[PDB]
């Protein structure tokens, strides 16, 4: 039943008495559901340490992973170039999932095409699909460059990208001079950031491998900036703003910020901004190249050092005070441009907010997850705050990254109770936060279920979620935020301190029970 003046959606419509009676009859009659006492017993068992010991002995099953496959990162890298179509050689369901997943995160149109390989290609390959797809895409969507990645289908069948594209060009399906870079992105190797790295290395190799003869290092007085897999527009904005305030010439390679933030003014822009082909062709003439996320840009680093002969600096991600300082000092050294007074003022303001919020931030315990560079930057920042990371988990991390994070933790007394986990999933983390309860989690939307589980154990056992990372599905416009630089550190500190204050207000809102500590001023 619905009242026309106050219509109810599923919540709280299905909390009506008739619907509850219906659900009770259904469950008791035909679902053959386990008794509630058995369910409670099993849940309580799953919150225990013995269950955790069983859970961490897993070798074959993965529950609730925190990573994606390579072609997603390849598509994200491809979208960062001017009028470039992402072209994924393989099956179409992969492209449908990529498009929907980026649509839910960015809440923006995301363009990508497939060649729709089917059971026929499973024995013949995808030459015909490649030719027809390149011709159709070029004729229909009018792009300047087609950047080709692969699905696991073509990878297993061993489709030869270079041969396919060459045969497409020599038979007239696409013009010979037309830029078609390619990269193999196997989904059973690495993760989405590995796909980003492979795609960028492929594009760079396509544009500069065969024309190094006339290239002189440093002859354009610019700095190449490679961001890596990045789903915050504000990071691109802050890096450009910080470089521009310094008066430093720069080239931002694979810059997708415009195409993911087009205005709603009555027309659809499939392409917007991006890195030009001229910029990519001229990049080897730069003074040097900076990788913002070095721990998933290793193949790109090998190509840039081996071929462009750029002495790539050993820099961490510019997250937090010390690493932003190191990044800016390295830029000042390479370009010869002194650090301006505005940046000094901004750093002082960030320090001021730190000293203002330190009392509330001291000693708080955090579990957290995400991509390796983001995780290590967040851990360094939390150590700079006086906070205590305890469960540091990176599903797509490796052993060298683990060693570096351990070295970072050892340098601070606040990392004494911290453990770093690689290869583990969110179910492992659920066990970790049940058996050693922290104060808050920092992660993507998938953590919300974990919060639910903790709230089911009790209000005193609930671990609140803080949404920093990728993907963020159940909140709006958080992809506009910034985590890099002093501005990123400022927003992260504001978010953390205000989450702590909000939790404190929730805990002390009880009239005549806990509201003695419900202070007006905090």
């Amino acid at each position: 039943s619905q009242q026309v003046d106050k219509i109810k959606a599923s919540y709280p419509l299905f909390l009506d008495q008739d619907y509850k009676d219906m659900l009770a009859k259904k469950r008791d009659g035909f679902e053959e559901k386990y008794p509630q006492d058995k369910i409670d017993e099993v849940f309580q068992w799953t919150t225990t340490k013995e269950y955790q010991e069983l859970n961490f002995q897993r070798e074959a099953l993965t529950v609730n992973p925190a990573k994606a496959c390579q072609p997603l990162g390849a598509v994200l890298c491809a979208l960062g170039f001017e009028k470039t179509m992402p072209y994924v050689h393989g099956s179409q369901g992969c492209v449908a999932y990529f498009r929907s997943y980026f649509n839910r995160h960015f809440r923006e149109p995301v363009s990508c095409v497939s060649d729709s390989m089917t059971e026929d290609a499973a024995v013949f390959g995808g030459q015909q699909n490649m030719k027809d797809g390149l011709q159709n895409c070029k004729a229909t969507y009018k792009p300047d460059m087609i950047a080709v990645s692969t699905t696991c289908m073509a990878e297993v069948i061993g489709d030869d990208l270079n041969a396919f594209i060459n045969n497409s060009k020599k038979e007239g399906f696409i013009p010979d001079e037309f830029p078609v870079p390619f990269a193999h992105t196997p989904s059973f190797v690495g993760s989405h950031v590995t796909g980003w790295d492979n795609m960028f290395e492929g594009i760079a190799r396509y544009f500069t491998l065969k024309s190094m003869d006339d290239k002189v290092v440093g002859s354009n007085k610019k700095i190449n900036i490679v961001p890596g897999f990045e789903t915050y527009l504000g990071n691109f904005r802050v890096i450009k703003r910080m470089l521009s305030e310094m008066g430093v010439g720069y080239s931002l390679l694979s810059d997708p910020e415009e195409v993911l933030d087009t205005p709603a003014d009555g027309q659809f822009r499939m392409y917007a901004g991006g890195t030009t082909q001229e910029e990519m062709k001229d990049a080897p003439n730069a003074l040097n190249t900076v990788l913002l996320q070095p721990w998933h840009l290793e193949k790109t680093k090998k190509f840039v050092e081996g071929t462009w002969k750029h002495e790539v600096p050993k820099l961490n991600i510019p997250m937090g005070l010390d690493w932003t300082d190191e990044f800016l000092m390295k830029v000042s050294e390479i370009s010869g441009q002194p650090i301006p007074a505005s940046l000094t003022k901004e750093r002082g303001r960030l320090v001021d907010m730190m000293t203002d919020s330190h009392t509330w931030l001291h000693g708080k315990r955090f579990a957290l997850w995400g991509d390796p560079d983001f995780v290590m930057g967040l851990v360094k920042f939390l150590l700079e705050l006086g906070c205590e990371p305890v469960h540091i988990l990176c599903h797509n991390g490796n052993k060298r990254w683990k060693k570096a994070v351990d070295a970072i933790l050892a340098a601070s007394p606040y990392g004494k109770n911290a453990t770093v986990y690689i290869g583990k999933d969110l179910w492992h983390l659920r066990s970790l936060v049940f058996t050693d309860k922290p104060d808050f989690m920092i992660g993507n939307s998938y953590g919300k279920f974990i919060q639910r589980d903790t709230l089911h154990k009790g209000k005193e056992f609930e671990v609140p979620l803080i949404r920093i990372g990728f993907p963020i599905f159940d909140r709006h416009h958080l992809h506009r935020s910034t985590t890099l630089g002093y501005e990123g550190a400022m927003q992260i500190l504001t978010t953390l301190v205000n989450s702590i204050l909000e939790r404190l207000d929730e805990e002390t809102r009880g009239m005549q029970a806990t509201d003695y500590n419900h202070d007006l001023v905090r």
Partner: protein
């Protein structure tokens, strides 16, 4: 009404493509004539998509894991292969259920085998067995395991049928292998077919020799309703207000015991023809269970469906049906009175999957809304046979439309409202045209039944009459 202009637009949109793609896509575009009963003479469907034209279709894994098997709450579904698949399909579809997540229900979770290089090189049967043992260890109160294959499973020489048989015999557990590799078929429809075949082969016949379930002459099974936003629930109450008893619903909020009990019902009420007609026909052939289609979108179709369903039974059920009709008449009449004046005469274009494009038109017509163009991602010619008589004259029909084609059609026709998926939503919002998601329902609902009609009307009114749509042009330009 302007019939000649429609095919002129079709030709001008056709012009851009190369000759092969143009010849292929020409057969998938049509001008509707309600007098035509055989759709094969005007439109072709269920074909491979053209490479590089940015189709909307999914894969067979989406049709099997994400549509049919996923809503089963008390079973654990393992995405067998690399990690991307189950991650992108995790909790993307609002298939609602009641249960304790992680203890007796596993819908919103992503179980996967997560292949690396070594699993591709040397196979993954041993790791599948080890994974099954680990699933048994850490999730004891599940009631069955399904193994949904991804593309490498079929590409490399894995044989999960034998592993499933051995592990099920060893563990006394129902383990269902599903060969739903994404490269099979051309869309999600073959995923539906494969899922239904697996269901008949490994689940349906468990209780064939069992007669302990007490049955009544009023036993029905809701087939092909996946409880999107609670849709199935809003249907079930009405059927139980008519005096019926629903043993099972497929497959939203569904349980394996309900599927096993389905062969004991007296009538199979099929909501989604396209995804479950296979098992409906199999049940009619093997158990003698009659099945009929019904429509619960809008008061008119709901009333007609309830009257037909009651006509399948005795007089008491018919009298209860009339009582239900009289009880719910004032509510939807009030909904119409409040919302029909603010949506009279507006025009809608729909592009949805296999059932809803023709199947929600009556609810729009109940609001005085005209559907000027509709299309399917993966439908068959029989769905179009129903569609043509459901739609009006000189309205646009289109199968497996491309993004370019659909954008051009919207630019020319200029509808007031567009209903499609998440991959069109922001494209057509930035064009200045109101958009409603017709899959997850813009994360609202339910829309089925009388209670859902009010929510449907409210959502359409709130989106189409939104003050935002009058502000996209800057005052200085």
């Amino acid at each position: 009404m302007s019939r000649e202009e429609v095919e002129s637009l079709i030709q001008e949109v056709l012009e851009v493509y190369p000759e092969k793609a143009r010849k292929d896509r020409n057969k998938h575009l049509a001008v509707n004539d309600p007098a035509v009963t055989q759709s094969k003479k005007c439109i072709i469907s269920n074909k491979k998509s053209q490479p590089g034209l940015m189709t909307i279709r999914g894969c067979a894994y989406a049709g099997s894991k994400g549509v049919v098997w996923g809503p089963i709450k008390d079973m654990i579904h393992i995405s067998h292969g690399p990690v991307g698949c189950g991650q992108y399909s995790r909790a993307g579809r609002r298939n609602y259920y009641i249960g304790t997540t992680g203890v007796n229900a596993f819908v919103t979770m992503n179980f996967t085998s997560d292949f690396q290089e070594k699993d591709i090189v040397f196979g993954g049967d041993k790791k599948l067995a080890k994974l099954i043992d680990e699933v048994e260890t850490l999730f004891p109160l599940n009631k069955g395991i399904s193994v949904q294959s991804e593309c490498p499973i079929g590409l490399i020489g894995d044989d999960i049928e034998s592993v499933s048989k051995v592990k099920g015999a060893e563990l006394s557990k129902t383990i269902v292998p599903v060969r739903c590799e994404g490269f099979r078929g051309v869309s999600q429809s073959l995923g539906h077919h494969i899922a239904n075949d697996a269901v008949r082969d490994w689940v349906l016949g468990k209780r064939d020799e069992d007669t302990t379930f007490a049955s009544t002459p009023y036993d029905v099974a809701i087939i092909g309703d996946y409880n999107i936003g609670g849709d199935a629930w809003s249907s079930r109450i009405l059927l139980e207000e008519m005096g019926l008893r629903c043993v099972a619903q497929w497959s939203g909020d569904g349980s394996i015991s309900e599927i096993e009990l389905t062969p004991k019902v007296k009538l199979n009420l099929v909501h989604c023809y396209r995804s479950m007609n296979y098992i409906s026909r199999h049940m009619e052939e093997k158990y003698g269970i009659p099945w009929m289609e019904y429509n619960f979108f809008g008061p008119t179709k709901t009333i007609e469906s309830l009257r037909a369903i009651a006509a399948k039974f005795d007089e008491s059920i018919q009298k209860k049906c009339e009582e239900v009709i009289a009880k719910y008449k004032p509510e939807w009449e009030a909904v119409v009175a409040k919302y029909r004046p603010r949506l009279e005469g507006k025009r809608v274009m729909l592009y949805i999957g296999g059932l809803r494009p023709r199947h929600v038109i009556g609810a729009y017509e109940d609001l005085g809304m005209e559907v000027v163009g509709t299309g399917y991602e993966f439908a068959h010619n029989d769905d179009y046979d129903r569609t043509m008589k459901e739609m009006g004259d000189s309205t646009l029909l289109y199968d497996d439309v491309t993004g370019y084609e659909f954008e051009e059609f919207v630019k020319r026709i200029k509808p007031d409202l567009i209903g499609s998926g998440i991959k069109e939503k922001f494209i057509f919002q930035k064009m200045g045209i109101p958009f409603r998601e017709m899959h997850s329902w813009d994360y609202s609902g339910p829309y089925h039944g009388f209670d859902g009609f009010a929510i449907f009307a409210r959502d359409m009114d709130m989106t189409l009459n939104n003050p935002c749509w009058k502000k996209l042009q800057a005052p200085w330009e």
